[PDB]
């Protein structure tokens, strides 16, 4: 079964023709490297829509997970390959699969700022309030990273505006810690709790004054 190694190296090389030759020669479509990464992992990581379709049409495990908990949907969502994300979900990819950091594809897409993919994952039934190892929902990541569009997308799909992480910090805290005043207002418009403190005992107003963003602090102080 030597061909399985050649398929993994061909898939990540994006070699369309060589993959089809190894496929037809009886190579294992679910071969794994030292990381338990399948050719579908490498095809999705490369961005080769043609090879992802070939591997999926030949029964590659869509929900294959390498020893880090990363699935092909995790990789396509991180890298921003909207076309490949659609085909993986087309083939029943677990939209709420989590890696060893507890992050779902909606976590990764939101952290990186792929607004189109955050929408597509939501449209395919992604858990909006999913929590990672830090207890952070995609809204936590989006609010900290300043992606106002993704923040609004998550909010209109039922995101908890007052979700607390392991530190007890809501998105209002994270938005105030990075000076995203525009997101502070968008969160407040959806019922963010100004009078909400973390385990450390500091509210969104307390973080802004500790960061020096008193401009944003007067915003929370009014309403």
């Amino acid at each position: 079964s030597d061909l399985g190694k050649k398929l993994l190296k061909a898939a990540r090389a994006g070699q369309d023709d060589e993959v089809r030759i190894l496929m037809a020669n009886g190579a294992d479509v679910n071969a794994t490297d030292i990381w338990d990464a399948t050719p579908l992992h490498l095809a999705a990581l490369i961005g080769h829509l043609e090879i992802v379709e070939v591997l999926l049409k030949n029964g590659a495990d869509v929900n294959a997970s390498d020893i880090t908990g990363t699935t092909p949907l995790h990789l396509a969502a991180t890298m921003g390959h909207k076309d490949i994300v659609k085909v993986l979900l087309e083939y029943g990819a677990d939209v709420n699969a989590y890696d060893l950091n507890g992050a779902t594809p909606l976590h990764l897409a939101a952290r990186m700022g792929h607004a189109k993919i955050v929408l597509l994952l939501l449209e395919q039934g992604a858990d909006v309030n999913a929590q990672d190892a830090a207890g952070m929902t995609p809204l936590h990541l989006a609010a900290a990273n300043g992606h106002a569009v993704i923040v609004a997308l998550l909010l209109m799909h039922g995101a908890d505006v007052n979700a607390k992480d392991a530190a007890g910090m809501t998105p209002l805290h994270l938005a105030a810690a990075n000076g995203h005043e525009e997101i502070v207002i968008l969160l407040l418009a959806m019922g963010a709790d100004v009078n909400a403190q973390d385990k450390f005992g500091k509210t969104a107003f307390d973080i802004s004054i500790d960061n020096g963003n008193e401009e944003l602090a007067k915003v929370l102080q009014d309403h």
Partner: protein, 219 residues
């Protein structure tokens, strides 16, 4: 032990693609991969593992270095041994936390991540016949093959309102003539360099030193 030329290029790419694993080569025999992240507790270079594999060699580990950035985050980086950097083949990169958790995973081609120095010697002059501005510059210093470099010049006017115009320059053209600039207007010009497709590939260089000019009247 701090490399100013590398740290200049490093901060350049970092500002373009934050929270990403960023790899580039200057002379095609080197390769540096780096990322930046907030300073977190006692997490040092021993809390991540940098794995890389190419062609039929076994997966190898690259020792990571760390240093704080000018903004206060920490930057981890790995400079691959020149013996292992071979262009035109896929190179798989993996950063895994010490716990085994995933951090970064990328596949690159070294010949597709070239990051040249900036162009130098920019000069702007008004053509004697027409009020056209003629920009000229020199290829980036110590670049292997200047024939496969393509440039892009930026035309800006006044502070805070930049990039009035971007002009793509044909391969190996070290000249640019601008013929639509409004008269009696102080313009400023800079120019980038990058390797030309499809033989190579990479990222725009940092902008050259700029050059300002006051266009003539009656335009």
């Amino acid at each position: 032990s701090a490399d100013p030329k590398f740290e200049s290029k490093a901060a350049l790419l970092a500002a373009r693609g934050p929270e990403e694993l960023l790899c580039f080569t200057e002379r095609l025999e080197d390769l540096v991969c780096f990322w930046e992240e907030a300073a977190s507790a006692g997490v040092g270079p021993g809390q991540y593992s940098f794995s890389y594999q190419l062609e039929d060699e076994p997966w190898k580990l690259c020792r990571l270095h760390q240093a704080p950035t000018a903004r206060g985050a920490v930057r981890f980086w790995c400079s691959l041994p020149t013996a292992d950097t071979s262009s035109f083949v896929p190179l798989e990169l993996r950063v895994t936390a010490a716990s085994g958790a995933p951090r970064y995973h990328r596949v690159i081609h070294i010949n597709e991540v070239v990051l040249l120095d900036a162009p130098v010697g920019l000069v702007a002059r008004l053509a004697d016949e027409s009020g056209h501005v003629v920009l000229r510059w020199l290829p980036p210093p110590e670049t292997p093959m200047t024939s496969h470099i393509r440039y892009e010049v930026d035309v800006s006017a006044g502070q805070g309102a930049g990039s009035v115009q971007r002009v793509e320059i044909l391969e190996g053209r070290t000249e640019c003539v601008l013929s639509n600039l409004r008269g009696r207007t102080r313009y400023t010009f800079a120019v980038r360099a990058r390797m030309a497709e499809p033989s190579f590939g990479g990222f725009w260089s940092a902008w050259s030193e700029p050059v300002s000019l006051l266009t003539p009247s009656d335009l």
